[PDB]
Design a protein around this ligand. Structure first.
Ligand SMILES: Cc1cccc(N2CCCN(CCC(N)=O)C2=O)c1
Ligand SMILES: [Zn+2]
Length: 140
């Protein structure tokens, strides 16, 4: 689990969104595994607006933050799962790192701010849903 709290927005994995998230919906995209809902309180996270390919992510199944090198956001085939049919997921970045299903939502960050959240994994890989192109998260 986990979310990004920027401005009056809560960014979560679409597959982990709550009923309250759907009832306060701003935007969602199944092809990216992202959903954004509105919040009453202002958050403290800042979104990175950069080209970093190195950063640090939080792994809840280890209670640890790990430094990683990650690929540029791309269209990657993601196997049918209990959350989606077999499909290509867009804006996904891969790295070598430990992950388990409940690690989704952990933040990946660089020196500029939050880069994305854990969305996929297995066999010593971890995939992150990028948010750096979502410029509207910085306004309204
Ligand atoms: C982090 C992690 C580790 C092990 C496994 C996973 N699973 C669990 C099942 C669903 N997906 C796919 C989600 C999607 N974005 O389509 C995973 O990759 C995640
Ligand atoms: Zn950066």
């Amino acid at each position: 689990s986990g979310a990004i709290y920027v401005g009056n927005y809560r960014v979560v994995n679409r597959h982990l969104a709550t009923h309250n998230d759907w009832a306060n919906l701003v935007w969602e995209d199944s092809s990216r595994d992202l959903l954004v809902s509105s919040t009453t309180a202002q958050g403290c996270d800042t979104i990175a607006r950069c080209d970093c390919q190195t950063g640090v992510y939080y792994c809840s199944s280890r209670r640890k933050h790990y430094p990683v090198s990650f690929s540029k956001p791309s269209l990657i085939f993601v196997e049918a799962s209990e959350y989606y049919p077999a499909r290509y997921q867009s804006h996904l970045m891969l790295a070598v790192g430990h992950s388990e299903p409940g690690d989704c939502g952990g933040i990946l960050r660089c020196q500029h701010g939050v880069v994305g959240i854990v969305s996929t994994g297995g066999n010593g890989l971890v995939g992150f849903a990028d948010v750096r192109d979502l410029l509207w998260l910085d306004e309204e």
